[PDB]
RNA sequence: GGACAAGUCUGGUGCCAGCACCCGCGGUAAUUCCAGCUCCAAAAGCGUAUAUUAAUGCUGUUGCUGUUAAAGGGUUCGUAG
RNA sequence: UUCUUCAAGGAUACCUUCCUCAAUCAAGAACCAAAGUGUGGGGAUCAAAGAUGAUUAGAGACCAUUGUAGUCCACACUGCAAACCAUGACACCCAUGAAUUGGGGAGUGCCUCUCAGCACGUUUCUUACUUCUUCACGCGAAAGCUUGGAGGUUACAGUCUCAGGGGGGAGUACGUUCGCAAGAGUGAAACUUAAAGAA
């Protein structure tokens, strides 16, 4: 029984033969790049409570200058994406929603 | 001159069926989407006369969404729709 | 579909000859190995001498002794 | 590649009749195609058709009228004797009351009712009903 | 919880429908009326029925209710709503100029009747 | 003690409609089995049980059993109908299938193998009917040859009024449910084929709901 | 779980078992020959 | 529309075009479906489609001749799920005398015969073929023809006569129902052609 | 008992003895074993064993199947055909 | 990754040339991931075998610290993968709506030279990878497929070719060809079982 039409990746037939593998962000397992689950994360270096204290002690960030952020591209194997609740199992007929952009 | 005839003149067929005027196909007895439309004729005055022109649509043509297109051509041929606006 | 030749009878004959060995019924009647392994040399009955009387048990769902002889 | 232009044309026509169209275009056409069409037209099964001329194999535009149910070529063109007409009818026809099997004889291309009258035989070409 | 079941709710709507008059926002007056025009065996149900009827009347005093459907209120709403202005809004619009797009004008010229009056491109 | 619920039922209760051919001509649904009872003599009813087997559905603490029954109803000649229903008891499933069989009734055409002499005896064309894996083919045959068919298609073809036909089959015919319905689908197709004698452009008439619309107007 | 009901142990390890059988048979016939 | 012994009657007049253009009944949406591509006549620089007026009037009269040919007016049912059509549905039924269905369409009103709201209309009129799909699907089971007001993006399955118009905009639907009501009465009834009709389109307008 | 026409009959045995081409029957109320009585088929005929033809579209020219049930060669070039 | 080089390949454009030169294939040929083999280099990382520490009733395993062959290059071998779209190659017909890659035809922004240039907006067209939840008909045991169909098929015929024949024994035994070896290709039977299997 074929569960998915694209077989879980983004490689149509007659398009490619091989895609280079990457390492999982968490368990370091090798997974092809199109099959893996990828998220672009932008996170602050300090939370709201700590940012207030550090801004008060500083002259650079003390008056309306943004604090730096952390930018990373994370790629997951299927097991580590399910276990970390990045993605979830979905009902049949709901497995087709695509969400082309992050919102 | 409808149906099958014996070597004598007796017509042995029962229930000669309807033929759709758009597709020239028999309208069977288990086809529940087949419809009949009656359009009234009128006098030179705007009052209806009392005679109707009748149309037959097959029934699979409706589910395909081509029922509207067929009716336009049928009504044009029958002389009930003016195909193009007249010259000034 | 398959070969449709009007001059391809050789190919169709070879195909049927090769593929006819694949059914166990047809192979058993053209191979001579069955007759050798069969205690009756392809005969309806045969005559023998009784050696001893044995009792063999029945298969699992059943339970009995089937009273055979060794010939 | 394209091996039979008669099998091609008869496949285009039966395809358009299945969908419900009113006209078909057929390429590349040939003498055998035209003579096959004239047999169907003469028995009142297609309607008017016209041949457009390029300085190549032409094209044919055929008008339909909803009477054709199926038409197809027989390949390879087997051989039929004047006593063999029934056997073909029993196989590839819905009934013996209506339908036609088109043959090519030395008199010319013509259906099996005319061929029996002239008491001839030859190679089958196709059928239609 | 204090949810009122379907039996309580349906009877309350029927009472309000038939006897909208004589009803008011006082529970105790409503209870006496309900006891008069009901034949229910249980006293507990009659208390709840009068309770839900007062709640409906309070909502009715503020606005319409989907299930109530009072006859007199409907007629007053219908007469108000079936009002006709002194001059049709379309008539005012035709009296003022009608502005149409250039290709909208293109088909009007091609049409037999031609460009109508009170029509301008922009 | 039957009061009709539809417009067609009201006409049939009176004498406005008298032949099933009038109903079949406009492809209107029946939706009421008393229509067939009145329209047919009822001496030509001829019901027939064909199959009654149990079906099960697993539940917690055991299972649940129901019975499916297939009924075939046909007159002497030209009318056939098949129906299936389910019930908690064998008796209930029998009665329900009888009503369902009468609801779906179709006319089946007939013709001649060769020269046309007397009444028609065989189907006019070869027709196939498919339901699941089971496909049933019917072939016109010369007179005298009986109904060359398995016991199940033969019983159905008797009620339809055919006395002469050749039968070929494919698929898992051991499934009697699919065997019964595959033949019924084959008989329905006899009136869909466009033979060359029906080319014959013919005018259009008016449906009963229009012709007798005045009578249906007043009253309930 | 990805495949359906193997008959008697993982097919890959059954394959490796027979390969070691064929090697031992080859070594045994070389002694005589 | 044409007529045997054609006398140029039943033709679009100057005032009709003024009313149609006044309330923007000739403006489509940005996208179009293949079924409705014939009725479109050109497109603006913005991206809005323009509906050919001549064919809109041609279908409008053709539908009127079908409705007027029914002897019993109760055998015509008018349906609408959109809010903006509910008022026009009511007034249309009042003037012509046709049964009507408004709001949610209960599935089973045409097929469930043992019911207290079972109906058997002889023709059906719907405001929009997309939001009234349940009515169209149900009519496909009991041999009922359908007349619909279609926009440029409408799906035309189970739709027999389509009147290209503007389904959106509160005043647009009211204009079309007003014209259809007037034409039916002119075709048969006590309304003469010469005297303008006395009722007001604002009556057909939907208000809170 | 069913396929398959013909008993919800009466005694005996108690997973034994036995039947059963296949599904199955027999552990104390056996519709299947050993018997009596009825009945069914065909009849001067009727069972059993082995081989073979039809059933078989399960060898397919007419006329099979090959995504997942057995089965498309790893990919190209290429001669006879 | 960039720059410099060498020979190729497809699409498009064309009122260029030629005139059946073609399609598909036993035998035969060339290429073919990883692991593996031979001879020279190279040896940072990771890491079969092996060694320690834990966990455990036991733990030869999973976890931790290491560690040889290998992993990298050149030249010779091997010829197997869930080498998969589990779907052989050539040709015809076949409903819609939004996108995307390359070539060609017919208002806006940048603009001292790989520049009479470069992007974009609107409408057509040939080729390629595909998507529809607002995609047909039709087909299929179903899951599903649908303009590289699994459609146009009991209304069965466009052309060629490779495989199958209830489950096991078994891709095993014997013979033979190829290989340094590991292995590869070809390939049974005696016996045994009423099911195994698909959705
Ligand atoms: K993925
Ligand atoms: K069979
Ligand atoms: K699983
Ligand atoms: K088979
Ligand atoms: K390790
Ligand atoms: K392989
Ligand atoms: K490209
Ligand atoms: K698609
Ligand atoms: K589906
Ligand atoms: K080997
Ligand atoms: Mg490519
Ligand atoms: Mg790969
Ligand atoms: Mg699974
Ligand atoms: Mg498998
Ligand atoms: Mg026997
Ligand atoms: Mg028992
Ligand atoms: Mg045989
Ligand atoms: Mg392949
Ligand atoms: Mg190979
Ligand atoms: Mg980079
Ligand atoms: Mg390597
Ligand atoms: Mg090495
Ligand atoms: Mg080395
Ligand atoms: Mg390490
Ligand atoms: Mg298949
Ligand atoms: Mg075939
Ligand atoms: Mg086998
Ligand atoms: Na046979
Ligand atoms: Na397989
Ligand atoms: Na794959
Ligand atoms: Na394979
Ligand atoms: Na070997
Ligand atoms: Na499963």
From TrEMBL, chain B:
<protein>
    <submittedName>
        <fullName>40S ribosomal protein S21, putative</fullName>
    </submittedName>
</protein>
<comment type="similarity">
    <text>Belongs to the eukaryotic ribosomal protein eS21 family.</text>
</comment>
UniProtKB/TrEMBL annotation, chain C:
<comment type="similarity">
    <text>Belongs to the universal ribosomal protein uS12 family.</text>
</comment>
<protein>
    <submittedName>
        <fullName>40S ribosomal protein S23, putative</fullName>
    </submittedName>
</protein>
UniProtKB/TrEMBL annotation, chain D:
<comment type="similarity">
    <text>Belongs to the universal ribosomal protein uS8 family.</text>
</comment>
<keyword id="KW-0687">Ribonucleoprotein</keyword>
<dbReference type="InterPro" id="IPR000630">
    <property type="entry name" value="Ribosomal_uS8"/>
</dbReference>
<protein>
    <submittedName>
        <fullName>40S ribosomal protein S15a, putative</fullName>
    </submittedName>
</protein>
<dbReference type="GO" id="GO:0006412">
    <property type="term" value="P:translation"/>
</dbReference>
<keyword id="KW-0689">Ribosomal protein</keyword>
<dbReference type="GO" id="GO:0022627">
    <property type="term" value="C:cytosolic small ribosomal subunit"/>
</dbReference>
<dbReference type="InterPro" id="IPR035987">
    <property type="entry name" value="Ribosomal_uS8_sf"/>
</dbReference>
<dbReference type="GO" id="GO:0000314">
    <property type="term" value="C:organellar small ribosomal subunit"/>
</dbReference>
<dbReference type="InterPro" id="IPR047863">
    <property type="entry name" value="Ribosomal_uS8_CS"/>
</dbReference>
<dbReference type="GO" id="GO:0003735">
    <property type="term" value="F:structural constituent of ribosome"/>
</dbReference>
<dbReference type="GO" id="GO:0005737">
    <property type="term" value="C:cytoplasm"/>
</dbReference>
UniProtKB/TrEMBL annotation, chain E:
<dbReference type="InterPro" id="IPR036401">
    <property type="entry name" value="Ribosomal_eS17_sf"/>
</dbReference>
<dbReference type="InterPro" id="IPR001210">
    <property type="entry name" value="Ribosomal_eS17"/>
</dbReference>
<dbReference type="GO" id="GO:0005840">
    <property type="term" value="C:ribosome"/>
</dbReference>
<protein>
    <submittedName>
        <fullName>40S ribosomal protein S17, putative</fullName>
    </submittedName>
</protein>
<dbReference type="GO" id="GO:0006412">
    <property type="term" value="P:translation"/>
</dbReference>
<dbReference type="GO" id="GO:0003735">
    <property type="term" value="F:structural constituent of ribosome"/>
</dbReference>
<dbReference type="GO" id="GO:0005737">
    <property type="term" value="C:cytoplasm"/>
</dbReference>
<keyword id="KW-0687">Ribonucleoprotein</keyword>
<keyword id="KW-0689">Ribosomal protein</keyword>
<dbReference type="GO" id="GO:0022627">
    <property type="term" value="C:cytosolic small ribosomal subunit"/>
</dbReference>
<comment type="similarity">
    <text>Belongs to the eukaryotic ribosomal protein eS17 family.</text>
</comment>
<dbReference type="Pfam" id="PF00833">
    <property type="entry name" value="Ribosomal_S17e"/>
</dbReference>
């Amino acid at each position: 029984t074929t569960k998915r039409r694209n077989h879980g990746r983004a490689k149509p037939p007659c398009s490619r033969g091989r895609v280079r593998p990457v390492h999982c962000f968490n368990c370091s397992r090798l997974v092809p790049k199109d099959k893996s689950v990828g998220r672009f994360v932008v996170r602050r270096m300090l939370d709201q409570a700590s940012a207030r204290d550090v801004a008060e002690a500083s002259l650079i960030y003390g008056s309306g200058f943004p604090m730096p952020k952390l930018y990373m591209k994370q790629r997951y194997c299927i097991a580590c994406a399910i276990h970390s609740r990045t993605v979830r199992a979905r009902p049949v007929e709901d497995r087709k929603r695509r969400y082309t952009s992050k919102v | 001159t409808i149906g099958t005839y014996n070597e004598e003149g007796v017509n042995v067929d029962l229930y000669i069926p309807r033929k759709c005027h758009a597709t020239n196909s028999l309208i069977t007895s288990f086809d529940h989407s087949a419809v009949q439309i009656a359009i009234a004729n009128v006098d030179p005055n705007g009052v209806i006369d009392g005679t109707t022109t009748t149309l037959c649509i097959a029934g699979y043509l409706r589910c395909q969404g081509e029922s509207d297109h067929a009716i336009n051509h049928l009504a044009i041929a029958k002389g009930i729709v003016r195909i193009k606006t007249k010259k000034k | 579909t398959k070969t449709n030749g009007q001059h391809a009878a050789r190919k169709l004959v070879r195909l049927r000859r090769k593929n006819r060995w694949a059914d166990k019924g047809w192979k058993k009647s053209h191979t001579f190995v069955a007759q050798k392994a069969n205690p009756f040399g392809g005969s309806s009955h045969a005559k023998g001498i009784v050696l001893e009387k044995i009792g063999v048990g029945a298969k699992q769902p059943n339970s009995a002794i089937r009273k055979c002889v060794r010939v | 590649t394209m091996m039979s232009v008669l099998a091609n044309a008869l496949r285009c026509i039966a395809g358009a009749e299945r969908r419900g169209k009113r006209q078909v275009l057929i390429r590349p056409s040939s003498k055998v195609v035209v003579k096959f069409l004239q047999v169907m037209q003469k028995h009142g099964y297609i309607g008017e058709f016209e041949i457009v001329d390029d300085h190549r194999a032409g094209k044919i535009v055929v008008n339909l009228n909803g009477r054709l149910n199926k038409c197809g070529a027989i390949c390879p063109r087997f051989d039929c004797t004047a006593r063999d007409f029934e056997k073909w009818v029993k196989n590839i026809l819905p009934s013996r009351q209506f339908g036609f099997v088109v043959l090519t004889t030395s008199l010319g291309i013509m259906d099996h009712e005319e061929a029996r009258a002239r008491n001839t035989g030859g190679k089958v070409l196709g059928f239609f009903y | 919880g204090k949810i009122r079941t379907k039996t309580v709710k349906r009877a309350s709507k029927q009472i309000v429908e038939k006897y909208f008059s004589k009803l008011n926002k006082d529970f105790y007056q409503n209870k006496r009326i309900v006891m008069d025009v009901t034949i229910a065996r249980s006293k507990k149900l009659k208390n709840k029925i009068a309770g839900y009827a007062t709640h409906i009347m309070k909502r009715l005093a503020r606005g319409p209710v989907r299930g109530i459907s009072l006859k007199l209120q409907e007629e007053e709403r219908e007469r108000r709503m079936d009002y006709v202005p002194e001059v049709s809004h379309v008539d005012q619009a035709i009296q003022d100029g009608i502005r149409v797009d250039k290709q909208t004008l293109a088909m009007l010229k091609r049409m037999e009747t031609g460009v109508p009056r009170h029509v301008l491109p922009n | 003690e039957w009061v009709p619920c539809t417009k067609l039922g009201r006409l049939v209760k009176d004498q406005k409609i008298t032949s099933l051919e009038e109903i079949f001509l406009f492809s209107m649904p029946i939706k009421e089995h008393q229509i067939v009872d009145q329209l047919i003599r009822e001496g030509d009813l001829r019901d027939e049980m064909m199959l009654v087997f149990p079906v099960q559905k697993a539940t917690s603490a055991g299972q649940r059993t129901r019975f499916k029954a297939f009924n075939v109803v046909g007159d002497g000649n030209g009318h056939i109908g098949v129906g299936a229903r389910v019930g908690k008891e064998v008796s209930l499933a029998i009665r329900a299938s009888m009503i369902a069989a009468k609801l779906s009734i179709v006319p089946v055409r007939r013709g001649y193998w060769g020269n046309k002499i007397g009444e028609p005896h065989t189907i006019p064309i070869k027709v196939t009917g498919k339901c699941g894996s089971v496909a049933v083919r019917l072939i016109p045959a010369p007179r005298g040859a009986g109904i060359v068919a398995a016991p199940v298609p033969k019983k159905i073809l008797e009620f339809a009024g055919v006395e002469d036909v050749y039968t070929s089959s494919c698929g898992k015919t051991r499934t009697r449910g699919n065997f019964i319905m595959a033949t019924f689908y084959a008989l329905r197709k006899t009136y869909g084929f466009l033979t060359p004698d029906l080319w014959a452009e013919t005018e259009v008439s008016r449906d009963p709901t229009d012709e007798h619309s005045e009578f249906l107007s007043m009253g309930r | 779980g990805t495949i359906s009901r193997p008959g008697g142990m993982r097919p890959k390890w059954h394959k490796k078992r027979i390969k070691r059988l064929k090697r031992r048979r080859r070594r045994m016939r070389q002694r005589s020959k | 529309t044409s007529v045997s012994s054609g006398a140029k009657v039943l033709r679009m007049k100057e005032s009709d075009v003024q009313k149609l253009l006044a309330m923007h009944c000739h403006l489509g949406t940005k996208n179009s479906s293949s079924a409705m591509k014939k009725y479109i006549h050109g497109r603006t620089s913005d991206g809005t489609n323009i509906i050919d007026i001549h064919m809109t009037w041609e279908k409008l009269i053709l539908a009127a001749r079908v409705i007027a040919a029914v002897e019993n007016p109760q055998d015509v049912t008018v349906c609408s799920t959109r809010l903006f059509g509910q008022r026009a549905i009511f007034k249309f039924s009042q003037l012509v005398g046709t049964s009507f269905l408004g709001g949610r369409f209960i599935p089973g009103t045409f097929t469930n015969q043992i019911q207290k709201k079972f109906m058997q209309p002889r023709v059906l009129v719907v405001t929009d073929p997309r939001t009234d799909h349940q009515a169209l699907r149900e009519a496909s089971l009991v041999n009922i023809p359908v007349i619909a007001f279609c926009d440029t993006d409408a799906p035309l399955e189970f739709v027999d006569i389509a009147i290209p118009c503007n389904n959106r905009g509160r005043h647009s639907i009211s204009m079309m129902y007003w014209l259809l009501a007037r034409e039916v009465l002119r075709l048969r009834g006590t309304i003469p052609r010469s005297v303008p009709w006395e009722v007001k389109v604002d009556l057909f307008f939907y208000r809170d």
